[PDB]
């Protein structure tokens, strides 16, 4: 087992964090594309 698991976290969520980190570690010249991706539009409709 990993630390993130058992802690309630799943792998997609890990990948999420990992992928974002790599982004924040880029340089404006490639930082633009960051927006043209990693969206968050989707909205939950739970009933």
């Amino acid at each position: 087992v990993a630390y993130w698991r058992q802690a309630g976290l799943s792998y997609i969520r890990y990948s999420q964090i990992c992928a974002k980190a790599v982004r924040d570690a880029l340089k404006t010249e490639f930082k633009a594309n960051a927006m043209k991706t990693s969206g968050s539009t989707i909205k939950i409709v739970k009933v």
Partner: protein, 215 residues
């Protein structure tokens, strides 16, 4: 045929034509961008599917429909809905998810008491892996221990054609523990847990990236 009425009709059709020509150009722009981002997505999504076709997966013994919120796109929604009702009928327990308000309004009423979740804010802005991860997460965090699921969406083919297709979601971490999977050894019972979760987001993403291009 009254010069009054005739004029009334011309009035409303000249506007329609104007608003309708506008909507066309906006779309063709969204389409152009979508057609391109779709190149990589396929290779990526087809890659995710590269394991299961390259090696069997069945099931001993969740319908996901993807489209959008906006209409005026011919039969994008009606198609997935049509095939969505077809499955729910032919079938084993039934539970469903619709990404894009239109699905939640169409293959709906008849099957509300057959819903798990629904998604909004789909189609206006280009889909992301990020949106796919929300869909996947929302499911994993659901009490539905689905044994097998299918994902129904519109696979692009050209500006004048698309085809509503289905993709199996053997995400059952349980099913990925069959004979055919004996060929691949040195696999922790829980390394798969990560593997499946991931390939679940990849498949939702793929369908999503195909969908907006068709739409």
């Amino acid at each position: 045929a009254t010069l009054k009425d005739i004029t009334r009709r011309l009035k409303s059709i000249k506007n329609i034509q104007k608003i309708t020509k506008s909507m066309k150009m906006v779309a063709a722009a969204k389409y152009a961008r979508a057609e391109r981002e779709l190149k990589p997505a396929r290779v990526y999504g087809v890659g995710s599917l590269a394991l299961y076709e390259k090696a069997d997966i069945k099931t001993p013994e969740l319908i996901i429909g993807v489209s959008s919120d906006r209409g005026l796109c011919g039969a994008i929604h009606s198609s997935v809905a049509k095939q969505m009702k077809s499955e729910a009928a032919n079938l084993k327990e039934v539970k469903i998810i619709g990404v894009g308000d239109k699905i939640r309004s169409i293959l709906h009423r008849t099957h509300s008491d057959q819903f798990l979740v629904t998604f909004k804010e789909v189609g206006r802005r280009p889909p992301t892996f990020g949106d796919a991860s929300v869909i996947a997460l929302e499911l994993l965090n659901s009490g539905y221990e689905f044994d097998e699921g299918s994902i129904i969406f519109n696979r692009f083919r050209s500006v004048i054609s698309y085809k509503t297709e289905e993709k199996p979601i053997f995400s059952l971490d349980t099913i990925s523990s069959a004979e055919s999977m004996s060929i691949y050894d040195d696999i922790d019972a829980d390394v798969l847990r990560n593997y499946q979760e991931y390939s679940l987001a990849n498949i939702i993403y793929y369908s999503l990236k195909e969908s907006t291009t068709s739409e």
